[model samples]
Target: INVKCSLPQQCIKPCKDAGMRFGKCMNKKCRCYS
Candidate 1:
C-alpha cells in the first residue's frame, strides 16, 4: 500500500492540517504530466 498524493502541495496541506503521521508521500516530482 502507498500514500498517493497527486501533487506536492496536496501532501503538505493534509499533513499540516490533520497533524497526523503519513508514509511514503508519492508522485511529488514524478512526470505524470505530458
Candidate 2:
C-alpha cells in the first residue's frame, strides 16, 4: 500500500510509527509500504 502526503515527513513519521516501510517520495508525496 502507499500513502500520499503534502510532506515526506508527514507520511514517513506515521508510516514508521505504524511499523511500515517508507518507500520513497513520488508525485510530490510520500510512498509507504508494508
Candidate 3:
C-alpha cells in the first residue's frame, strides 16, 4: 500500500478514513498509527 504525504497532517483524512486517528511518516509515506 502507498499514500504520499508531505506531512503528518496531510495523512489525517487518509488515516481516519482508514479507521485510524494518527498519522506519521519518515519515508514520506502516509500511514495510520492508530
Candidate 4:
C-alpha cells in the first residue's frame, strides 16, 4: 500500500520506523510499500 503525504520525507521515517519500505515521492505524495 502507498501512503499519501505533503512531503515524501514526512512519510519516510514513520513508514521505515514501522518496518515498511519507504518509496520515493510521486503525484504529490509519498509511497509506502508493505
Candidate 5:
C-alpha cells in the first residue's frame, strides 16, 4: 500500500489480483472499486 502507480495498465492486474476493479488512476495512484 505504499508503492505508487502511474498507469492504468500497470494497475489493472494489481487491483484485479487484489479482488478489486481498477477504476482509474488518481494522484499517481490506482483507484480500486467494486
Candidate 6:
C-alpha cells in the first residue's frame, strides 16, 4: 500500500465527504478515488 498524497487537494474532498480523512494507493492504483 502506498500511503502518499498523489492527487490534488481538491481531489481528496470527495473522499473526505465519505468519512475518509486520509488518502492512499493500493494495487498500483489510487483506492481513495472510489
Top candidate, metric TM-score:
3
> After aligning candidate 6 to the native by TM-score, how far in Å is the CA of 28 from where it should be?
7.3
Q: Residue 13 error for model 6, in Å?
A: 1.7
TM-score of model 1 (CA atoms): 0.23
lDDT of 3 by residue, 1-34 (tens): 6667656666777777677767777675776777
Compared with the true structure, model 2 gives a TM-score of: 0.38
lDDT of each: 0.41, 0.60, 0.69, 0.61, 0.65, 0.50
TM-score of each: 0.23, 0.38, 0.46, 0.34, 0.41, 0.26
- For each candidate, C-alpha RMSD in Å? 9.3, 4.3, 1.9, 4.2, 2.5, 6.6
Clash counts per candidate, in order, are 0, 0, 0, 0, 0, 0
Q: Show pairs that collide, candidate 6.
A: none
Clashes, model 1:
0
Error of 1 at 25 (Å): 7.7
Tens-place lDDT digits, model 4, residues 1-34: 5456645446658567656654567776676665
Q: For candidate 3, what's the RMSD?
A: 1.9
Clashes of 3: 0
lDDT of prediction 1: 0.41
Q: Which sections of candidate 2 miss by over 4 Å?
A: 1-11
After superposition, the stretches of candidate 6 with alpha carbons farther than 4 Å from their true spots are: 1-11, 26-29
lDDT, residue 2, candidate 3? 68
Best by lDDT: 3
Task: Give the Cα error of residue 8 in candidate 4, in Å.
Answer: 6.1
Cα lDDT tens digits, model 2, 1-34, are: 4445545445657567667654557775666666
Per-residue error at 7 for model 2, in Å?
11
1-34: candidate 1 lDDT, tens digit per residue: 2344545344554455555444344454311221
Candidate 6 residue-wise lDDT, 1-34, digit = tens: 3434455344475466566555555454444533
Compute the lDDT of residue 34 as modeled in candidate 1.
14
Pairs that collide in candidate 2 are none
On lDDT, the stronger of 3 and 4 is 3
The lowest-lDDT stretch of 10 consecutive residues in candidate 2 is: 1-10
